[PDB]
Amino acid sequence: IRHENRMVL
Amino acid sequence: LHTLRYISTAMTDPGPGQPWFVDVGYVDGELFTHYNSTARRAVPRTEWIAANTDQQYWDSETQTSQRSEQIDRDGLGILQRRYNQTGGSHTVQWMYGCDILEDGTIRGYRQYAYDGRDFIAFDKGTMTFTAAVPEAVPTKRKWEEGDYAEGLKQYLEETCVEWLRRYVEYGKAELGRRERPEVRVWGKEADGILTLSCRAHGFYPRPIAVSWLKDGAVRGQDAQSGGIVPNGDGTYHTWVTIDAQPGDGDKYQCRVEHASLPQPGLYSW
Amino acid sequence: DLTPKVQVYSRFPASAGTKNVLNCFAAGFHPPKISITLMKDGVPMEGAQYSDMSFNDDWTFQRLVHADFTPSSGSTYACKVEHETLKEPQVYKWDPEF
Numbered sequence: 095i096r097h098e099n100r101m102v103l
Numbered sequence: 104l105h106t107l108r109y110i111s112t113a114m115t116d117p118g119p120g121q122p123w124f125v126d127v128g129y130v131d132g133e134l135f136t137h138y139n140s141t142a143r144r145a146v147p148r149t150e151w152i153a154a155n156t157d158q159q160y161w162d163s164e165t166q167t168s169q170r171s172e173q174i175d176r177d178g179l180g181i182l183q184r185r186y187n188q189t190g191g192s193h194t195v196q197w198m199y200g201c202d203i204l205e206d207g208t209i210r211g212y213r214q215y216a217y218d219g220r221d222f223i224a225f226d227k228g229t230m231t232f233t234a235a236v237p238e239a240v241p242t243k244r245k246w247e248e249g250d251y252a253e254g255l256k257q258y259l260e261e262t263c264v265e266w267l268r269r270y271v272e273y274g275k276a277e278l279g280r281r282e283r284p285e286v287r288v289w290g291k292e293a294d295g296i297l298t299l300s301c302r303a304h305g306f307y308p309r310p311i312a313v314s315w316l317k318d319g320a321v322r323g324q325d326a327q328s329g330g331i332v333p334n335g336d337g338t339y340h341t342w343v344t345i346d347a348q349p350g351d352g353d354k355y356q357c358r359v360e361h362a363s364l365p366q367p368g369l370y371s372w
Numbered sequence: 373d374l375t376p377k378v379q380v381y382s383r384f385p386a387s388a389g390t391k392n393v394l395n396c397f398a399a400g401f402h403p404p405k406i407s408i409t410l411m412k413d414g415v416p417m418e419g420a421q422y423s424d425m426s427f428n429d430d431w432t433f434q435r436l437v438h439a440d441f442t443p444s445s446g447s448t449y450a451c452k453v454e455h456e457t458l459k460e461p462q463v464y465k466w467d468p469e470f
Contacts, residue, residue, distance in 0.1 A: 101174070103182055334438070
């Protein structure tokens with residue numbers, strides 16, 4: 095499954 | 104031995120009618136899922152993933168992709184400003200996933216590129232983010248103060264691997280198959296030179312060795328290869344050429360070594 | 373920016389009158405916007421399918437275009453590529469090898 099993350103540049 | 108890779112592209116200039124955000128996933132190099140900013144749904148791309156997942160699986164994948172889309176939508180503006188750029192054509196790419204190697208060790212990675220050049224990558228072993236350029240230092244600093252490394256390590260070492268092992272079982276019949284190539288040797292003479300080509304059509308899996316032999320002995324002088332390129336159906340293609348003297352065609356053989364051939368194949372023009 | 377490296381080839385070793393698939397594979401390019409058109413006798417071929425935008429380990433972009441076709445002698449087939457690294461469309465001819 096895809097990684098649900100909240101890493102914003 | 105086995106790989107799970109997810110990638111995405113975010114574009115300021117995809118072209119007319121084309122989606123600006125495209126995300127695709129691969130198991131053992133085979134495309135098995137897709138999402139873009141136009142259809143806005145994550146979908147299966149093999150029969151073996153479709154047969155072994157349910158609607159909740161795809162609703163969850165879609166939710167994840169829509170979150171990735173909104174983050175990268177803003178990322179395009181963020182990095183244009185980071186680089187003091189005005190508009191123009193720019194891209195943000197990332198790739199992440201996990202590898203199961205043959206001895207049983209696991210690797211995991213997550214890396215980014217801006218305008219096609221390395222920007223930042225996870226260093227899982229030190230739980231830090233490696234800036235490739237000065238412009239990535241503000242990103243590194245934010246992700247390291249924010250303790251994102253914890254969840255990323257957990258995804259790469261646990262979630263990614265656990266699902267990769269399932270995907271390989273779901274697709275065992277397709278991923279583990281062997282398809283024998285159809286091989287053609289052809290010749291063309293021009294400018295006093297005979298160029299011999301050998302093309303292997305439709306082999307699976309991807310690794311292959313195609314060589315030219317002259318009077319039985321291997322020859323690489325003035326030989327060229329187009330590498331391995333894909334067919335529409337998940338099989339592969341490759342061509343190799345060699346330059347010979349006109350009239351010397353009978354002395355050459357093409358040799359094909361492939362998992363589908365218990366004995367290597369020899370072919371004449 | 374990187375110019376596309378293009379190969380044109382059929383799914384099966386071709387013979388006149390035998391159903392086949394014509395492939396055009398462009399790789400190694402940047403930016404990702406690209407036009408790739410399969411042609412028969414100077415006219416765009418019907419039935420073409422385009423892979424969704426993807427890229428290799430080195431971040432360079434690639435796309436496969438393919439269309440079902442039945443090769444005919446005395447027809448010519450090609451792949452026409454437009455990219456901003458190119459000053460004019462580049463036409464790559466298919467060798468039928470028969």
